């Protein structure tokens, strides 16, 4: 399902990257960045964004984007709810969902991403 994750900061850079299967280039997020350029603010980006070979299912909370990569047809709410669940677990372990906490505990972030998602199907 959810194929790769691209946490994106407020300024418009690739804050964090994770891949579960064959790696998609970071050039997949330029469509999202173009959408943000078209969007009035951070609240006007559609959760599902189409790319020529992938689909970007993204959520925005705690001043941070959770951009996931989708290749095959998937329930959009499946991926959106999974992103919000991973954000909730991020907040639970960190105590607050913030750029600095993730930047400091990248290793625990990767451990949590691997624990939550196993080869495309979220399960714990």
């Amino acid at each position: 399902m959810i194929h790769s994750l691209f946490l994106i900061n407020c300024s418009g850079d690739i804050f964090l990257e994770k891949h579960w299967k064959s790696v998609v280039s970071q050039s997949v997020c330029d469509y999202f960045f173009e959408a943000q350029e078209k969007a009035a603010d951070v609240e006007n980006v559609p959760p599902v964004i189409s790319t020529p070979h992938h689909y970007l299912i993204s959520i925005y909370r705690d001043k941070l984007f959770f951009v996931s990569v989708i290749q095959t047809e998937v329930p959009p709410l499946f991926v959106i709810e999974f992103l919000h669940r991973v954000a909730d677990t991020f907040q639970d372990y960190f105590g607050e969902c913030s750029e600095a906490a993730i930047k400091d505990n990248v290793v625990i972030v990767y451990e949590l991403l691997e624990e939550m998602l196993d080869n495309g199907f979220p399960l714990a």
Binding site: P75, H84, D118, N119, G120
Partner: protein, 570 residues
């Protein structure tokens, strides 16, 4: 960092691997460092094994040849006593795309699927995913493995097993045809993501293998019912999409309570829910009628969330509530959200078409609205009235005269075209201002937008056909200006329009008909909500959201005339 890993100190290796994982998260290239990492894959420290396997999972497809050099190590890792190690080793083996790894991968998947630990079983389902993505020609024995997996009682495996079945063999319905009972009974206890996947597949299966509402067809509905209260948005939407596509129309309305409840959730959750509910409301209006007030726009929601709420309100408009909505639309028009303000202006016209009895009342809201100082509101207000004025081709002088005076202060290209178009149709109804409008635009033609230019030739021809006694020079002026325009579209129209109008020397039978075709009464536009196109798509799926058949769409069939043999399915 290479020498740091080559050190016999395990803590040094751990620190180096943590740094490597960090720079991977940064996205930098660590493929050069693969020769050092592959050396300690057989280390006895569990943490270093986990980090090393993360690195191997990330860079196994990059440095494929060194992984080829160390396949036997992965073979030995497949027998590791700790389950996560077996899963990771099978994952790394599946990551290799060399056309030779195939039979080893096949034996690996067979052993994993036969092994007792459920975690490696779901990882083996993902392994057959990967192999089918790699070698499609093994699908017979892949399907055999899937048949073996689907019989497993564990739900943790069951979700991933269903997904593997579906992407590998979506057509071999018989395997799920056998364990319909097991899957439906486990659907209460299956984990939520597995619940979503199983519910989508069961909706497709029920659409294929049943006729109009069979005890088994009710068995799906009987056990899917308790999930409508689930906290997961995907689960409830999956159940709601199940009821819409499977349940009788007399019972499927029960989902409108839970679907509306989801609108209290986050922005992203309700963006899809509003998109689905918009399509549901078109075909069956009465189910969402009692919750009309729950779809009233709040100013806190963003433009795209509010706009979808507007589209639901349009589809729910009826003569018993059109007046209530029309008053509410007037509230939203002067909102500070210019993008949303345009949408509500569009909403009024759509409700005016749906409710034919309030066409005059809807106009009165808009014609007086034409005096607003906002440049965008007047831009779309004249567009929407144009549709309403087109629908009733009556001499609505109290409206059209207002626009013609306004046109001198309109800059938006679409709005300028709409004003020029209404003037062209009603040239005989306004024979005193229409000639001056063309004269105003002819001077400014060179600076107009490409879309606006087209309507001036349309205006220029229409005025010529009725009042050539005095606009013949104006028409020739504007046609000559468009003849040399940069965009070839205008050069195409000018070539066509001039040919139809000017050359009376070659006035054949078709040219004497020219006044008829341009001045022909324009049929009302069958304006369609941007959600009726979703009638061809399953609710709750990606293809429904994009309105395009996404790669791997699992198309629903039509209800079969006769039900396939229920006695086989036991």
């Amino acid at each position: 960092l290479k020498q740091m890993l080559e050190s016999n100190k395990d803590s040094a290796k751990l620190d180096a691997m943590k740094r490597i994982v960090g720079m991977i998260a940064k996205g930098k290239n660590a493929s050069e460092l693969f020769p050092a990492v592959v050396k300690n894959v057989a280390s006895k420290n569990i943490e270093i094994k986990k980090l090393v396997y993360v690195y191997l999972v990330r860079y196994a497809e990059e440095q494929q040849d060194l992984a080829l050099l160390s396949i036997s190590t992965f073979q030995r890792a497949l027998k590791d006593p700790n389950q996560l190690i077996r899963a990771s080793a099978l994952r790394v083996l599946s990551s290799i795309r060399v056309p030779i790894i195939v039979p080893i991968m096949m034996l690996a998947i067979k052993e994993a699927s036969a092994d007792l630990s459920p975690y490696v079983r779901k990882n083996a389902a993902h392994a057959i995913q990967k192999l089918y993505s790699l070698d499609p020609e093994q699908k017979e024995m892949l399907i055999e493995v899937i048949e073996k997996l689907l019989k497993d009682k564990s739900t943790l495996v069951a979700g991933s097993v269903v997904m593997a079945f579906e992407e590998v063999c979506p057509d071999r319905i018989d395997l799920i045809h056998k364990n319909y009972r097991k899957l439906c009974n486990l659907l209460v206890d299956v984990e939520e993501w597995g619940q979503v996947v199983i519910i989508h597949m069961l909706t497709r299966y029920a659409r294929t293998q049943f006729v109009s509402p069979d005890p088994d067809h009710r068995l799906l509905i009987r056990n899917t019912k308790p999930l409508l209260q689930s906290r997961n948005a995907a689960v409830v939407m999956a159940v709601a999409q199940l009821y819409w596509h499977i349940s009788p129309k007399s019972e499927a309305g029960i989902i409108s309570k839970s679907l509306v409840r989801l609108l209290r959730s986050n922005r992203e959750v309700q963006y899809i829910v509003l998109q689905n509910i918009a399509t549901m409301s078109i075909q069956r209006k009465g189910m969402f009628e009692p919750y009309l007030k729950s779809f009233y726009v709040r100013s806190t929601d963003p433009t795209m969330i509010k706009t979808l709420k507007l589209e639901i309100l349009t589809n729910l408009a009826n003569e018993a509530n059109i007046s209530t909505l029309l008053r509410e639309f007037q509230t939203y028009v002067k909102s500070q959200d210019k993008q949303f303000a345009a949408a509500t202006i569009q909403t009024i016209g759509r409700c005016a078409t749906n409710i034919l009895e309030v066409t005059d009342t809807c106009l009165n809201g808009l014609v007086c609205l034409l005096s607003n100082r906002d440049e965008i509101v007047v831009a779309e207000s004249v567009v929407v009235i144009k549709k309403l004025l087109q629908m009733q081709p009556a001499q609505h002088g109290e409206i059209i005269k207002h626009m013609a005076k306004l046109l001198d202060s309109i800059t938006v290209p679409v709005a300028r075209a709409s004003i020029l178009w209404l003037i062209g149709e009603n040239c005989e109804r306004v024979p005193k201002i229409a000639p001056d409008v063309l004269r105003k635009m002819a001077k400014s033609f060179t600076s107009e937008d490409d879309l606006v230019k087209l309507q001036i030739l349309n205006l220029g021809a229409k005025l010529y056909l009725t009042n050539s006694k005095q606009t013949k020079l104006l028409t020739q002026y504007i046609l000559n200006l468009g003849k040399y325009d940069q965009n070839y579209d205008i050069r195409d129209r000018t070539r066509f329009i001039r040919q139809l109008i000017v050359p009376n020397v070659k006035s054949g039978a078709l040219s004497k008909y020219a006044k008829k075709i341009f001045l022909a009464q324009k049929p009302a536009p069958l304006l369609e909500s941007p959600f009726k196109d979703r009638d061809h798509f399953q609710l709750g799926t990606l293809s429904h959201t994009l309105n395009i058949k996404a790669t791997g769409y699992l198309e629903l069939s039509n209800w079969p005339e006769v039900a396939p043999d229920p006695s086989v399915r036991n």
